[PDB]
Amino acid sequence: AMKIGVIGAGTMGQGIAKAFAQVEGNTVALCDIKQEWAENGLAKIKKGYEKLVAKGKIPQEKADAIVAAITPGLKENLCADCDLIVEAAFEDMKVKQTTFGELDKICKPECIFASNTASLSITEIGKGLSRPLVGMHFFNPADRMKLIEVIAGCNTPAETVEKIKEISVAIGKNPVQVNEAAGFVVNRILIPMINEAAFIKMEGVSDIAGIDTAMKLGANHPMGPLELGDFIGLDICLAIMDVLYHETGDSKYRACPLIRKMVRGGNLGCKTGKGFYVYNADRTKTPVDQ
Amino acid sequence: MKIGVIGAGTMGQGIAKAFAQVEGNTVALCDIKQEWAENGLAKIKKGYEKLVAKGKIPQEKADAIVAAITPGLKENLCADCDLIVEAAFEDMKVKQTTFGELDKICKPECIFASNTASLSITEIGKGLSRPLVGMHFFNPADRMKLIEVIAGCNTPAETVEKIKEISVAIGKNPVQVNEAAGFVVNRILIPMINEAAFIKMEGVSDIAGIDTAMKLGANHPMGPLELGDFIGLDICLAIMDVLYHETGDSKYRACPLIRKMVRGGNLGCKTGKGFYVYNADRTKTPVD
Amino acid sequence: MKIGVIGAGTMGQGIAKAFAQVEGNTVALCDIKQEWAENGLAKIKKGYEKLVAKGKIPQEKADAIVAAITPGLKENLCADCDLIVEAAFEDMKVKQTTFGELDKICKPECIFASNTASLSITEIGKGLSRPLVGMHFFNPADRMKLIEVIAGCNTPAETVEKIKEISVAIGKNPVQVNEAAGFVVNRILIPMINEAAFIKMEGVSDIAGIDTAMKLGANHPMGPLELGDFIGLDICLAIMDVLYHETGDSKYRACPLIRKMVRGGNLGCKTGKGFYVYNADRTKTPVDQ
Amino acid sequence: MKIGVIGAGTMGQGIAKAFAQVEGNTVALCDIKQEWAENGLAKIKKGYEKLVAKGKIPQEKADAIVAAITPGLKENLCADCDLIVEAAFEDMKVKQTTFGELDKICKPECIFASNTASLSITEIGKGLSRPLVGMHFFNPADRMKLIEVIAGCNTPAETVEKIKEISVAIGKNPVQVNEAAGFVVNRILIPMINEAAFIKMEGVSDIAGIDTAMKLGANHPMGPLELGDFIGLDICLAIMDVLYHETGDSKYRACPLIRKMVRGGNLGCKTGKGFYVYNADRTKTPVDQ
Amino acid sequence: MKIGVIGAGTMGQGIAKAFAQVEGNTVALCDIKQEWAENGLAKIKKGYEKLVAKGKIPQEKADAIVAAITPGLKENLCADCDLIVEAAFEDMKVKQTTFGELDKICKPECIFASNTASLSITEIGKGLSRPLVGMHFFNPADRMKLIEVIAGCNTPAETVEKIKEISVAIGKNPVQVNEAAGFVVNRILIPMINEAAFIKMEGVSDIAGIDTAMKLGANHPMGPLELGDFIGLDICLAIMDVLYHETGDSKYRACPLIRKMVRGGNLGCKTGKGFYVYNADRTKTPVD
Amino acid sequence: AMKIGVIGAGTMGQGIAKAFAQVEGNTVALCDIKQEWAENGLAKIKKGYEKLVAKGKIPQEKADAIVAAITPGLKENLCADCDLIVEAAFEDMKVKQTTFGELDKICKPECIFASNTASLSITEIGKGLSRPLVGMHFFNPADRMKLIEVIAGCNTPAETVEKIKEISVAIGKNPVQVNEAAGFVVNRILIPMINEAAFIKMEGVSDIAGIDTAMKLGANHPMGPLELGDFIGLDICLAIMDVLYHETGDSKYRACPLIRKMVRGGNLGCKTGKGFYVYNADRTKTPVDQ
Ligand SMILES: CC(=O)CC(=O)SCCNC(=O)CCNC(=O)[C@H](O)C(C)(C)COP(=O)(O)OP(=O)(O)OC[C@H]1O[C@@H](n2cnc3c(N)ncnc32)[C@H](O)[C@@H]1OP(=O)(O)O
Ligand SMILES: CC(=O)CC(=O)SCCNC(=O)CCNC(=O)[C@H](O)C(C)(C)COP(=O)(O)OP(=O)(O)OC[C@H]1O[C@@H](n2cnc3c(N)ncnc32)[C@H](O)[C@@H]1OP(=O)(O)O
Ligand SMILES: NC(=O)c1ccc[n+]([C@@H]2O[C@H](COP(=O)([O-])OP(=O)(O)OC[C@H]3O[C@@H](n4cnc5c(N)ncnc54)[C@H](O)[C@@H]3O)[C@@H](O)[C@H]2O)c1
Ligand SMILES: NC(=O)c1ccc[n+]([C@@H]2O[C@H](COP(=O)([O-])OP(=O)(O)OC[C@H]3O[C@@H](n4cnc5c(N)ncnc54)[C@H](O)[C@@H]3O)[C@@H](O)[C@H]2O)c1
């Protein structure tokens, strides 16, 4: 028995709502700024489940049971008796401090405040609050990836972190404790990978398909780093690289200019149909270097 | 086709098996001492009997592979070789004189390839009478499917192409690489291990946590700290130092934590202790 | 052909001359203040007078090229031009806004070219209706024979080629260059100037010594410190900053001596004081005396 | 005056010419192998023959300067010289040893000067009995008018001045420079070449484009890639490495494309292949074709 | 001599006392609001009565210092000032327009000086009709003896010399500085505090241990982590960021540990918690 | 009651021997490679004490009592029943591993092995030993500076560190625990100070006397950083800067070229009569920039 409020109905908010709603005994309030926005979020969840049912990867009952646990609305209306708040709204500092400032008055004292941010400081978001703010970082798709990075801020008490650890185990995830630093663990290791592969291509060491083939066969990775950058989104990789660079001040994390040029041109990868690979209707992908 | 493998260590053994695996290939497994070459084939042979007993290879096929491998010295076995793959000790002068001697022994049409990962292909074959190309295998070479074909500064495109064709003939996937420090895999893979150590060093997370996050968050087969322990932390340290000295870029500075562990003999699996202690059972315990 | 030059500074003037000195071209000069745009065609008439007096130009030729330059009001005239060359301030949102207010004013079929020194061609032309290409001139634009032709990711070959033909049609040599911070010349030339300032700041030599060393040792036409003053030290600083921010590499960090000089208005020739003081006798004097 | 040149490569030859082409001087050329030292005076006689045939030199003048260059055996002749100019391999212990074996051979009162490109003047001359001064020539030494005069911490003014007088006495322009890695010209010029290689390696432009850009855009006499081949790419690499190690600043990290070319013997003009291939037709061809 | 001090905060108060301490000087303590200037003098006055009660100053001398200080607005009090020392809010546009207004108010021979530590002296007085020089005091200005005289790009040597003479006239030791980020003291002192935080962050030692080692090993009066807490970690962070952005050199990258503490409001003494917790007694406890 | 063996009779070895011999109940075996070398070491200790007696800063009895506790000789002869070994010989890796390899056979099992190194790895020195190797770092002059940095290597057990902590407190010093990293704590902070001051001078920001005056009055430091570099020895500052740079690979610790040029010229500071200041017979020092 647990009531979970997810603030933000975009991609990540939908996946987090699904992650909690999969576990029996959990109810999710999927909130956003405008009521229609949260309705579109749940409709996008409903539309996604109808596809998995057609492809025979989920029973219709389970999809219906999951959807019936998610209620769209406003945090003023649905988050009073919540036990956990996981915010997953737009990555803007002021918006996050405003959301949690309002939630501090709406929610009961026992409610735990968590944020799914990846680019902003857990410490700075929850500065003026009356209760701890902790990082609960999921990975796309949140309902299937089993990792959760638990982020301890400068003033987050150890009990707050432990509670998030139990909640993660209860929903069938594997919590990993991270003391707040740019990129945490996964992003800090994974995104410089893609960056290095781009440097390799830009410097003419090898070609795109070669670079990806080498990392798949030589390191037994599931995807090549350039394939992965297209899938993750090159605009997101560029932002992570720049955040790592600005937080540390270390030229080690300087972004590859080839990546910066591609983002400027709108070649963001899978979501625009073209990145390091061109994605064609026949489900064929070809490297832009032919 | 007849191949000469120079160096009967672990890598040379794997390369010999990779070529002898394919019907119609003969391999000359050479070293500086005849006994070493015969010991290399003995290690190759006994490894195949464990495979036969495990029922994972016909007894006659294993007998055929071993029969296709001849041990000895390069002066005696490499005159009519079609391809030479060097996999001896990683020293520039050792490799240079080895290929200067092979330059006089081998017939003109014989191709000279090297398995080096850290030394410059271009510098290896600087003053030779024929091109030098890189044919970088991955351990275990008989099982791993990737072959990095390293083009030197003066390697003709025809030599690169023939190595590509040989790679597919033995069932591998060649990827052309213009010579640079760390090639492709090592340039991307080892700084990853280096980054994870930095994360540990700076107190961001714990060893087991770091490794857990990479397999469950990035879908990797092994965590980077386990991987560094498996590769061996002395190898990782040496690769980082090569990348640093070849580029002059502080981006590749090795994590001082790793350098401290290498100095204490904590190299990983090969010594039983790295980021993990490897107990007599099968479990491994992080030194955290 | 009708050409519209956006900007009336040292380079807007030279680009105008570069087109007007070739027969059958007509140029529309533009700036912020009409007074400054009129100061443009004024400083052009002024320089051709000295050249005619020195016998280097026939007065008939000079009067003919000055008759092909018509100072618009920032536009009104920039409406029928077959080619646009902007030479405004090296700031990003400045060039978007300008090209933004320009996609309306000019004719539907008309080529848009930017004379930017190091900025992204792709980002400058984003919301535009037509391609945006880089056409980089070099000070002095009427004399230097090189044109760098830079294409964005979304720049067709028909526009890159048309720029190449227009370049040879006015007696220039176009070299195509892929999009990167500083392209070729500026990426090489400006850190050279930056290095020269570092050498002065660390006291390895004085201003005079550094410039005669590079002139008498590398056969360079101007010392790197004169060339800094000639280009405009504000321009050099802006290019180093773009280099540093685009690559993230401290290799391109601007020399603090130049940043101090730009903060004081010691920009070089265009303010009479940079690394040299420019006296009315037509002589220059190093500020370190 | 009697002058002893230590080294018979491209610069030992040019420094010899620079002194011998001025009346009343006599030069002693030296190298490792007498065959190589004799190859020195041979390649000098060879070049003056082509100049005389081209009418650029009177044969009487050329024969007079070739008569002032006497190839010693690495010394025997370097004993009465009033000035030593070493132009040996740019390695530190190489120059100590050479100047070490030289403090005996030469006369007690005789000036020791090094033509080093970037190495510490102070460290080169440490155990010596006399001061050690830097006298830096520039390829081609008989034509380039600049001489960099570099003093160590323990170098008196009488020696720095005597070098300044000898410089003007042979028609050169001496500029004094404080001791630092690369002095002035090389610190500015070689990273310029290094940058040009980075631009090629990252595919911004091809070899031809880069060199015509700097020639037609900055009025440079040679493109930075030709100049790399002309200087010797081994020399450029050594200078970048000295720069990187002396400052510890990754700003001066040598371009990996140059290090790859030097490892292959593609040194430029002196091996017929660098960034260009040098054909017998007297034409050069970019290796990227 | 008559001095105008612009800004009645802590620094402006100290500079006013430093000049009014010396017999024959009058000071105009100005701000943007008349009440603020009067509150600055009130803080100056009450600080002197605690000194009289402590027996560390004659009652009449303290009465004379306070009497030499007049509060108000610069338009009313600064027309006949001989020297202007600005110590208001550190914003480029604020300081620029302040000196543009003073350019019209003050008599031509009046010298314009600024106490800024992070903003460019050269840029402050860019378009003025008279030179702008830096006169950087150290808190408490009436007690600390060092004065950094900052020469701008266009500051004449005569203006630098007159500030040197004024500094010795009021009993200080002027040190000429050609404008660069961090001048001398801040350029050396703050990266030291930054380094100690890096040492803590990387697990090399503990806070108390770090601070103990610096006073007992280097004979310093305060440990760097205590010093950062005393200076205030927001000030240290801002100085590191200025040094980084002005030089573009990664050598001055601020320690991410400090940036995390500043984000949590743990600024040091001014908030009661930094690297040390400052208890109600007098002891301080490291957050280790 | 404690027997202490000090290996190395140079400057640091003498000061360490004096540090232990000052405390009642301690006996010091001051060893070196050649017997005459250790005799010269004790003679230098004796000669130094005769000067302090003349200047009236120590009683002759105390000097005599301290000297009577120090015995010169060879480690093969004097270190069998030692309770602590503090090596302070020349900073060369192989020499240190050889010394401790030999001492492992000579000394009783209870003997603690310590090294006063500042530039070399505690972990690497004691790699193949049969007992722990720990860092016990003193500061010149060791008999008066109260700080001791206790250096834990990769395999140093916590009890070894604690024993060194007690020994330091027993001899009236203040131990600080340091986990092995280049420069430890003090050198890593202090030497970049001097380096930065040299950069300030080289870049023409201020003059030598100004830089030192500013740090003395502005930061309340006892010595200016350039004064301090001359006193410490510029050759030593250059070596520390280079060790920090090579261990980390971080351009942040790159040595100032002005310092490198001065070391090449023999201007090492106080010990050569000239560094950033010229030291004249009349005890007057003048900055080399006049
Ligand atoms: C690395 C370090 O440590 C220091 C260094 O060296 S850094 C590099 C320094 N050197 C440079 O930078 C060189 C840069 N490049 C240049 O300056 C120019 O490209 C260049 C001067 C070499 C151009 O070559 P050039 O002008 O054709 O040679 P130059 O001799 O000046 O002129 C050609 C003429 O030689 C003339 N000539 C007359 N007398 C001559 C003589 N005694 N010797 C040689 N040439 C003579 C001829 O007239 C010929 O011209 P024509 O064929 O048209 O009649
Ligand atoms: C920052 C960016 O984005 C890109 C950039 O701009 S980077 C910088 C690029 N620009 C450069 O590098 C310039 C470098 N410097 C140089 O090339 C040379 O110093 C220089 C060409 C400017 C030298 O000046 P110069 O040679 O005296 O001017 P130049 O016109 O070529 O020759 C002088 C002659 O003008 C001649 N002349 C004849 N017709 C002329 C005409 N229509 N216009 C101008 N000059 C004419 C005259 O004959 C005069 O010579 P005399 O007085 O002896 O008779
Ligand atoms: N040596 C050089 O000057 C160098 C050479 C080639 C190209 N670059 C680039 O050319 C462009 C201009 O160079 P410059 O020498 O004329 O600089 P400049 O300092 O002389 O002034 C630029 C001119 O453009 C005007 N301007 C600014 N914003 C404008 C706008 N929005 N619309 C119209 N006019 C505007 C300015 O008032 C000024 O007249 C820059 O992008 C520069 O990076 C200049
Ligand atoms: N473009 C240039 O070549 C450039 C220009 C000016 C100065 N620099 C410096 O001049 C010196 C030589 O330049 P280079 O062009 O002749 O190089 P190079 O490659 O042409 O050969 C140098 C010559 O000196 C010989 N040599 C090497 N060691 C010697 C020794 N111990 N004693 C006598 N001879 C020895 C070599 O055999 C060779 O003949 C170097 O220090 C270089 O840094 C060269």
Numbering used by the authors:
A (entry chain C), F (entry chain C): 0 to 289
B (entry chain A), E (entry chain A): 1 to 288
C (entry chain B), D (entry chain B): 1 to 289
The authors write:
The monomeric structure of A2HBD consists of two domains, N-terminal and C-terminal, with cofactor binding occurring at the N-terminal domain, while the C-terminal domain facilitates dimerization. The A2HBD protein exists as a hexamer in solution.
The crystal structure of the tertiary complex of A2HBD was solved at 2.2 Å resolution. The tertiary complex belonged to P3212 space group with unit cell parameters a = 90 Å, b = 90 Å, c = 212 Å and α = 90 Å, β = 90, γ = 120 Å. Notably, the tertiary-A2HBD protein manifested as a trimer, wherein only one subunit harbored acetoacetyl-CoA and NAD+. The acetoacetyl-CoA substrate is located between the clamp-roof domain (moving-helix) and clamp-base domain. When superposed to the NAD+ -bound form of the enzyme with the tertiary structure, the overall conformation has been changed, displaying an RMSD of 2.202 Å. The most notable aspect of this structural change is the movement of the clamp-roof domain, which shifts approximately 6.02 Å closer to the acetoacetyl-CoA compared to its position in the NAD complex, with a rotation of 11 degrees. Interestingly, in the tertiary structure, rotations of Arg143 toward the adenine ring were observed compared to the NAD complex, allowing the acetoacetyl-CoA to be stabilized through a cation-π interaction. The hydroxyl group of Ser117 establishes an interaction with the NAD cofactor, thus placing this residue in a bridge with both the substrate and the cofactor.
